[PDB]
Structure formats: structure tokens, C-alpha cells
């Protein structure tokens, strides 16, 4: 099979914030295809992985990955809040993200 994807793709919008105050401890992640919080309810608890490349070779590879998790839905458009052990850099606003299908229940 040409396609080996096993994770639902998405995008990173911005951290939870107000008009003038922003808390980077919570990140708003948009999942492609989701439209309402009801659909996003299935993605709750799914691990979120961000992949980026660095010139230096890290201990295991040339790829560095952050391991996060989903917490709860957000908004009426189906946006879901994401929390990571280490908050994502602000430069990744609008960047894509990987949402795995595990842990699952279906």
C-alpha cells in the first residue's frame, strides 16, 4: 500500500488564551474532518505527536518527537484541547500534528 498513515492529521492553532493573556500549558489542536464536539469526543485521550527535524543527530536518530495527550473538546467547531509534557514552541502555530489512534476502545 502506498499510504502507511495510521494517525489522523490535524493542525495547531494557538494555546488557550484570553484577549491579552495566554497560557501555553494548554494547546488548541484542530483535527481534519471533525466539525462538532460530538465527533471530537472519540479522539479524547488519543496521543498527539509532533515531528520536527534538526541538523544535529540526537541520541537515537535525526528525528525528535514530543509525546502529548488529548484532554477535552473546545469550541463549537470541534476543536480539541491538547496537553503536552513539554509545551510546543510558539513558532509552530498553524503547523500540522499527528494524532494516533491509540489508546482505543472500539
Amino acid at each position: 500500500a502506498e499510504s502507511h498513515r495510521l494517525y489522523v492529521k490535524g493542525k495547531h492553532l494557538s494555546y488557550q488564551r484570553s484577549k491579552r493573556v495566554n497560557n501555553p500549558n494548554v494547546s488548541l489542536i484542530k483535527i481534519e474532518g471533525v466539525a462538532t464536539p460530538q465527533d471530537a469526543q472519540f479522539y479524547l485521550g488519543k496521543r498527539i505527536a509532533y515531528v520536527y527535524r534538526a541538523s544535529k543527530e540526537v541520541r537515537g536518530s535525526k528525528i525528535r518527537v514530543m509525546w502529548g495527550k488529548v484532554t477535552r473538546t473546545h469550541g463549537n467547531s470541534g476543536v480539541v484541547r491538547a496537553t503536552f509534557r513539554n509545551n510546543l514552541p510558539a513558532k509552530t502555530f498553524g503547523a500540522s500534528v499527528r494524532i494516533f489512534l491509540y489508546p482505543s476502545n472500539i
Binding site: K11, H12, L13, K30, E32, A90, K91, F93, G94, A95
Partner: protein, 194 residues
């Protein structure tokens, strides 16, 4: 989603189209606008023309206001105010945007897209006046409208022949499918949804 999305400005509204394009850009989506010279703005021609002419003379004093004539640049300015420009995030978002009068190549040989919620005809109440933008650009100083139309006319030609060839190909494919019907594979596919 396609890596790049081409939006046809024909029959669209400047405000809603600019807002949605800016929102998509902030999300990190590449978008391109074509046929911007055919974009439309709500209200009669006089109202839109006055709203633009007054802008040209509001002063900052040439460092600030620029009497920019290109309708594509006018649309970019309209979208410019809907983005957090003068910052790395906003400026990077604008890098994924391009506006061209008509449909220059290689965008001609690619499928364009339209925004259902930004259609001028769909959202504008029937019978009310509207502005074609092209006349405003011509009156405010633009002079490439004639050339734009002249070289867009050739765009409809050749593309018409390509559409005719595709229509013949689809006719042949439909005939092949019709004669292919009633087969065991087709029957199984129909039973299993497909």
C-alpha cells in the same frame, strides 16, 4: 487537503472571502486567488468608489497611504487588515498568499475552488445593487482591464476544446460502464454499497 488551494474570485464577496482566506492562512493553509478582477463588493458603485477615494486622501505624508491601483493589491490590502501583520506569525501567513488577475499559468491546468459562504450571489439579497470592482479599479487609475479581458478571452478558448475532449472521453467511459453493467463484479459491488 490539497497542498495549495486556488480560489476563483468570480461572483464572490471581498469581505467574507478575505476573512476566510486570512483565517485559513493563520491555520497554516496555502491559498491562491485568481480572477480577482471579477470580484464583487456589496453596495452600489458610488458608495464603494467613495469609500476607496476617501482612503486615498486620509493621510498617514506619502510614507503611509499609497495610491495603489491594482485590484489584486486592493484585495490584499483588504485581507492585510484581517491578519496580525508586522509580526513573524502574521507575515509568514501572508507568504502563503498570491493574487493574480485572471488565471495565469500553471494554475490554468489545475482545478480551482470556490467558497460557498463567500458567494456574492448566494449571500447578497436578490435585486439589490452591487459593485463589480473592475469598474472601480478602472475609474481609480487601473488601466490593464482591457488587456486582462483580452488575454482572458484566449483562456476560455483552448480550455473549451479541452473540455470538449474531456466530454468525449467521459462519454466513452460512460458507454463502457453501461455495457459493463450487469456483470457479476458490478452486481457484487452494488450489493456491497459500491
Amino acid at each position: 487537503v490539497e497542498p495549495v488551494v486556488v480560489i476563483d474570485g468570480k461572483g464572490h464577496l471581498v469581505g467574507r472571502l478575505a476573512s476566510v482566506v486570512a483565517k485559513q492562512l493563520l491555520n497554516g493553509q496555502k491559498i491562491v486567488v485568481v480572477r480577482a478582477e471579477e470580484l464583487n463588493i456589496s453596495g452600489e458603485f458610488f458608495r464603494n468608489k467613495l469609500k476607496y477615494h476617501d482612503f486615498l486622501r486620509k493621510a498617514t505624508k506619502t510614507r503611509g497611504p499609497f495610491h495603489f491601483r491594482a485590484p489584486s493589491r486592493i484585495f490584499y490590502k483588504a485581507l492585510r487588515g484581517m491578519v496580525s501583520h508586522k509580526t513573524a506569525r502574521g507575515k509568514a501567513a501572508l507568504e502563503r498568499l498570491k493574487v493574480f488577475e485572471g488565471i495565469p499559468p500553471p494554475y490554468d491546468k489545475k482545478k480551482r475552488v470556490v467558497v460557498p459562504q463567500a458567494l456574492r450571489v448566494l449571500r447578497l439579497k436578490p435585486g439589490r445593487k452591487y459593485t463589480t470592482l473592475g469598474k472601480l479599479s478602472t475609474s481609480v487609475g487601473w488601466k490593464y482591464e482591457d488587456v486582462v479581458a483580452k488575454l482572458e478571452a484566449k483562456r476560455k478558448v483552448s480550455s473549451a476544446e479541452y473540455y470538449a475532449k474531456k466530454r468525449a472521453f467521459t462519454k466513452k467511459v460512460a458507454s463502457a460502464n453501461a455495457t459493463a453493467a450487469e456483470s457479476d463484479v458490478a452486481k457484487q459491488l452494488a450489493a456491497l454499497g459500491y
